[PDB]
């Protein structure tokens with residue numbers, strides 16, 4: 001059907017954090033950034049779309065950081081979210097699918113990750129197309145003293161992306177896609 005877009009998750013993997021070889025808070029490493037071109041896909045009629053991310057984990061505080069990945073030259077403030085594991089939080093950036101769009105630091109209760117223009121123009125959308133995708137960036141943060149050795153991180157839902165469109169019928173579906181931190185094992189060497 002014309003508006004039969006359906007959501008799919010975008011996921012990033014704890015298992016890509018390098019060994020943490022050892023001040024609070026501080027970033028202890030970055031995961032390998034991921035991308036999904038088809039977070040929303042399947043409607044037969046092209047649409048102008050945008051994605052609003054809402055983080056849904058506890059916000060512990062803020063930290064200044066500049067992702068080695070991505071192409072921001074300046075540091076930004078990021079909200080630290082609680083993984084649930086004591087001493088460990090994460091910071092999140094997200095971006096449009098294509099590499100020219102900027103990494104958007106997650107530092108407010110909700111934000112448009114693509115197009116970033118929508119954060120200041122409420123009538124700004126992506127150019128008409130048949131899908132909506134994104135890039136996901138995550139770094140782990142030490143919020144407190146870490147013990148030596150292996151630590152298991154549970155799989156966590158970092159938040160969701162809400163699909164918005166200037167087509168009322170598609171917009172009012174309020175389609176949402178989860179943004180997932182796939183759990184795994186990290187190692188601390190102190």
Ligand SMILES: OC[C@H]1O[C@H](O)[C@H](O)[C@@H](O)[C@H]1O
Pocket residue numbers: 037038096097098126127129130131132133134
């Ligand atoms: O394939 C084109 C398509 O790729 C992704 O899904 C983007 O999010 C869209 O804006 C569009 O560029």
Ligand SMILES: [Cl-]
Pocket residue numbers: 009010011034035036
């Ligand atoms: Cl994915």
Ligand SMILES: [Cl-]
Pocket residue numbers: 013016032034
């Ligand atoms: Cl990966």
Ligand SMILES: [Cl-]
Pocket residue numbers: 035036037038
């Ligand atoms: Cl993809």
Ligand SMILES: [Cl-]
Pocket residue numbers: 065066067070072074075076093103105
């Ligand atoms: Cl950055």
Ligand SMILES: [Cl-]
Pocket residue numbers: 155156157158
């Ligand atoms: Cl969760």
Ligand SMILES: [Cl-]
Pocket residue numbers: 166167168169
């Ligand atoms: Cl309409």
